[PDB]
């Protein structure tokens, strides 16, 4: 039961971990309730929240970085990836007493929402967890996209140059803050982008990015104060 939750999002599709979960949100925790696994995640465990559209024009994604990572049986998840039909909507009233709403939440939550599901979820997460929801910034690829196709290790994905980070989706998911970057290395009709980390923590290469995309990537990263050698 979840009668005690402030608000629940029922039957949400997560692509990682793969399955459908209810998301019961409380003042200091979220309970993820699946068919096989249930997990109580502290708000403190949520390091980052990213909301972005899929290349689809059908789906919207939300991504939560989790530390310590979520567990199901033996196996460990540093990122939760949730997926929504971009047009589905949610109408919901928060289960908060009026005085409790007024004392603690009047400036960061509404009592009633009626909006796209991912937008309601963003707002409730912001208000309850006090985290920023990161959205795609000024970067816009040669063909007016938020991201470029490439691979990390063998793994085909998309790299989003966000305003303050590199973000790779979806297998595996990686988030590298710019404040963790020592420098970038562009080597060669595709190119490889090496993100060298500070504190001798190594480097992460995003391989086989279209060459057409090099110049705008280079300029955006330099405008963000990163050392870009090519």
The residues of the shown chain that bind Cl ion, judged by CB under 5 A, are 13, 20, 26-29, 123
Total residue count of the chain as it appears in this document: 230
Buried b (16+ CB within 10 A) or exposed e, 114-139: eebbbbbbbbbbebbbebebbebeeb
- 92 or 217: CB nearest Cl ion: 92
Residue 68 beta carbon to Cl ion: minimum distance, rounded to whole angstroms: 17
Structure tokens at 151: 């691979």
Residue 84 beta carbon to Cl ion: minimum distance, rounded to whole angstroms: 6
From 77, 52, 76, select the one nearest 63 (Cα to Cα). 52
- 26 or 39: CB nearest Cl ion: 26
Total Cβ atoms within 10 A of residue 77: 17
Give whole-number Cα distances, 61 to 16, 51, 83, 85, 208, in Å.
Answer: 11, 6, 5, 9, 24
Residue 55 beta carbon to Cl ion: minimum distance, rounded to whole angstroms: 17
Residue 13 beta carbon to Cl ion: minimum distance, rounded to whole angstroms: 4
Any alpha helices (H) in 161-230, and if so which ranges? 214-223
| Nearest residue to Cl ion, by Cβ distance, number only | 28
- 108 or 142: CB nearest Cl ion: 108
- 28 or 200: CB nearest Cl ion: 28
């Amino acid at each position: 039961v979840a009668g005690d939750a402030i608000v629940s999002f029922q039957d949400v599709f997560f692509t990682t971990p793969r399955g459908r979960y209810d998301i019961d949100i409380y003042k200091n925790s979220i309970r993820l309730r699946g068919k096989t696994y249930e997990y109580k995640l502290q708000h403190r465990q949520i390091q980052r929240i990213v909301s972005l559209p899929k290349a689809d024009d059908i789906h919207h994604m939300m991504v939560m970085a989790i530390e310590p990572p979520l567990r199901q049986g033996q196996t460990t998840y540093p990122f939760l990836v949730l997926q929504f039909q971009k047009d589905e909507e949610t109408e919901v009233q928060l289960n908060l007493e009026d005085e409790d709403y007024e004392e603690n939440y009047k400036d960061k939550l509404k009592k009633q929402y009626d909006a796209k599901t991912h937008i309601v979820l963003s707002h409730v997460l912001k208000g309850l967890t006090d985290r920023r929801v990161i959205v795609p910034g000024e970067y816009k690829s040669k063909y007016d996209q938020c991201a470029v196709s490439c691979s990390f290790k063998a793994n085909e994905g998309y790299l989003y140059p966000l305003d303050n980070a590199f973000f790779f989706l979806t297998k595996p998911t990686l988030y590298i803050p710019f404040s963790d970057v020592s420098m970038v290395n562009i080597s060669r009709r595709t190119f490889d982008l090496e993100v060298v980390l500070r504190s001798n923590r190594g480097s992460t290469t995003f391989a086989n990015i279209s060459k057409e995309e090099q110049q705008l990537l280079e300029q955006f990263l330099k405008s963000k104060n990163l050392r870009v050698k090519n």
